Amino acid sequence: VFLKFVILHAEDDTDEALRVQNLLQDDFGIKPGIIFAEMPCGRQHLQNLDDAVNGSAWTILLLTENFLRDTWCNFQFYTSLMNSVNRQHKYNSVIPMRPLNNPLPRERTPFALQTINALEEESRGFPTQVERIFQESVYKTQQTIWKETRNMVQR
Amino acid sequence: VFLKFVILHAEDDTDEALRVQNLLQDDFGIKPGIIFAEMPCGRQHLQNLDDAVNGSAWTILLLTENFLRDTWCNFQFYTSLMNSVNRQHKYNSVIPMRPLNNPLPRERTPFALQTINALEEESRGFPTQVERIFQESVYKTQQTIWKETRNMVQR
Amino acid sequence: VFLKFVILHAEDDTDEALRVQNLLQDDFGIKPGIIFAEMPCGRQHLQNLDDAVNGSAWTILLLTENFLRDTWCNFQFYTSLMNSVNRQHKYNSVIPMRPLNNPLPRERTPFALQTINALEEESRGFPTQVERIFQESVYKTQQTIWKETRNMVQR
Amino acid sequence: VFLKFVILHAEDDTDEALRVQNLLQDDFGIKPGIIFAEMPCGRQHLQNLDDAVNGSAWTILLLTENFLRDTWCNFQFYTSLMNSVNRQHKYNSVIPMRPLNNPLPRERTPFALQTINALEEESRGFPTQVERIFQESVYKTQQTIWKETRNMVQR
Amino acid sequence: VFLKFVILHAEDDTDEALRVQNLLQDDFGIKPGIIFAEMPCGRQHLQNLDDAVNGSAWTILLLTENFLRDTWCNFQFYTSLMNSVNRQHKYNSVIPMRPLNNPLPRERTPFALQTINALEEESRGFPTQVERIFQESVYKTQQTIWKETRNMVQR
């Protein structure tokens, strides 16, 4: 399995993540895709995070007003940022998007996100920019590598 | 005999274990499966535990609010954890699941369980994640080995 | 009589038990202490086991390579494990220690022991950890109770 | 007892841990401090881990080239990470430090560690940064709480 | 602690940063001051960046020929630029200075820096312009605020 998109969320906002997940899968037909919670039960969350980073092309940060309020949440996506930096194959995989439900405002955004275009479903821009960018060839390039990039790990 | 699932329970909660056992067997058709109490009478509980660990693919921890309250109960599943660690054939066989009847809360969970996805029949997630995971091939792989893994013990 | 330590051994290894017994008594001055064989002649072994469990603070499992090879040997220390679980006064009295002479290896250890720190005279650790733990107050606490715990049985 | 530092190590590297332990204790006078192996014999390793987490101010990860190669080793420090996240009293207690003996290289570091400053005795930086940080008041603050934080557990 | 100056550098050029740091501290007596590497060990680099931005009056960009060659380096000082824009208290705190060791040439400078006076230790100008500008009152103004600006954060 390899995902077109993965949503990172706080459990308080899983309905929003789902809603987004639905919107992503349903409207765009962008499937398969996983939210952090679904990852195989009975395993370590950390290990699933690492595997999840590998298994997803793009990495959606559900920028909910209190997404930052829980410390470990800050820790989790930090590693994702590095992974985008580390591997060309994941370059810009980390997609900050303000939710509809209580988006994080610009007043206090962490500067790191301020340096990046943070999207929003409220905006006219989001769907056209996704359409223009999140396309077969862009995904095809990523997955084609991924599979062989993990065959090495299974030989 | 080899089990798809084995439930570990405290005698105070055997009705819940049964109910779960029924739900598992009845709804999913996941049969055969045993709860700790049923193991052959007249034998040592410890020895049955060891054999039970071998005889079951997955190992359900009935995380009842007072499941931890009895010390030996803590001892019992500790060994199961090791067995998951020890043998690939039992990797993640230990499935922490909060019951419906007075589940153990997150306030005081033993950190070890906190590191793991603990399931719950209250959740929307549990049945779909089981369906996606607890499937013929996954069980087939485990049992196929088990039988020969014990023929060695009976030659 | 109440013992600081009791050694459980197979007759094939009594020299090792003795050697250990000597080392324990001689080096540490930890006296008195008994090995399973010495228990009063002409009595039932089982009954001596029960009394021996009561009469000893700590309970050394001479983990010789074939200590497990004789079935009843497995049965004997099983009851000791329960007694540690049953009585606070005997909590952790059961001390698995790999001998010098052909210690049981980690390859096949019974998982129950794997969950526990099993000591070894080969290690640098064993003597310092004993010194730090097996001390007057720890023993004093146990014996002080024991005596009155059996006066009840003799009134 | 409460420790200024605790070293987490794989048994293959205990000499390095010791050497580090010596260097820490001897050069800086930072005493007392324990390595994972020393924890009271005859007890469960897991339980000692939990108590060890409580008993130490700082938590040194002996990042030896094969420290990650053993799975349970990965599991162990995962819980420590959470404990740093969970309790302010342990904030940043988890100190990743590359050993002298075959340090883990940056080529394959687990991203989580990549997000953190990992120290190294090879560097000019390590001793001055410790001196500037690991100081009476910082330790005093931690221990002063710890003692009362466990008096609650012993009342 | 509050710094007169902070140097931002790539690890390949730490000797230059040090040399500059020495020159700054030694020649001008401008102390204390920190280079990016020194920030407290065991913490997140990003968080230290944010705190470092607050803790320094002026922010030296070690414009080494390959300072831009590493992408995240570009990201880091971008946030600093904003902070100068955001807060009057940090207005022009960001001081681009070409090093002695392989300075970035004007041929390919990023236009943003081209709009700004970029200093150079090779020039006659640098020391007199620093003397005329980096003076007690200018620093006094900044620190006096800083301290109370963080008392708000610690009340």
Whether residue A85 lies within 8 A of chain D, CB to CB, comes out as no
- CA–CA gap between residue B54 and residue B61 (Å, rounded): 16
Q: Which positions 40-69 of C are in contact with D (Cβ < 8 Å)? A: 58
Show which subunits contact B, needing at least 3 CB pairs below 8 angstroms: A, C, D
User: Which residues of B are less than 8 Å from C112 in CB distance?
Assistant: 46, 79
Domain at C94, CATH number: 3.40.50.10140
CA distance B94 to chain A (A): 7
Number of domains chain B contains: 1
In the block, which residue shows the tokens 């960018």?
Answer: A133
CB C89 within 8 A of CB C149: yes
Verify whether the Cβ–Cβ distance B44 to C111 is below 8 Å.
no
Residues in B closer than 8 angstroms to A40, CB to CB, are: 92, 117, 129, 133
> Measuring CA to CA, which residue among C80, C92, C18, C9 is closest to residue C49?
C80
**Nearest-angstrom CA–CA distance, E5 and E25:** 9
**Residue of B44, B71, B86 with shortest CB distance to C111:** B86
Contacts of B50 in chain C (CB under 8 A): 110-111
Nearest CA in chain A to E53: A111
Interchain contact E83–A (C-beta under 8 A): yes
> By the CB < 8 Å criterion, does B85 face chain D?
yes
Interchain proximity D41–C94, CB inside 8 Å: no
Q: Note whether C38 and C21 are within 8 A (CB).
A: no
Measured between CB atoms, does D113 come within 8 Å of chain E?
A: no
Residue C33, classed as helix, strand or coil, is strand
HEC profile of chain E: CCEEEEEECCHHHHHHHHHHHHHHHHHHCCCCEEEHHHCCCCCEHHHHHHHHHHHEEEEEEECECCHHHCHHHHHHHHHHHHHHHHCHHHCCCEEEEECCCCECCCCCCCHHHHCCCCEECCCCHHHHHHHHHCCHHHHHHHHHHHHHHHHHHHC
What is the secondary structure of D35-57 as a DSSP string? EGGGS-TTSBHHHHHHHHHHHEE
Q: Measuring CA to CA, which residue among B54, B61, B2, B63 is closest to residue B30?
A: B2
Chains with at least 3 CB pairs less than 8 angstroms from chain A: B, D, E
C92 touches chain D (CB under 8 A): yes
C119, C137, E56 from C59: Cα distances, Å: 13, 18, 63
Longest alpha-carbon distance in chain B: 50
CA-nearest of C54, C19, C18 to C38 is: C18
- Distant-in-sequence contacts of A18-22, Cβ < 8 A, 24+ apart: A19/A100, A20/A60, A20/A62, A20/A97, A20/A99, A20/A121
By residue range, what is the domain housing residue D118?
3-154
Residues of E in contact with A112 (CB under 8 A): 46, 75, 79
Among D37, D39, D42, whose Cβ lies nearest the Cβ of C116? D42
The verdict on a CB contact (< 8 Å) between C111 and B72 is no
**Residue A14, token pair as written in the block:** 């899983």
Measure the CA–CA gap between A114 and E12, rounded to whole angstroms: 28
How long a stretch of residues is chain E? 155
Return the closest-CA partner of residue B141 out of B76, B73, B92: B92
SS3 call for D134:
coil
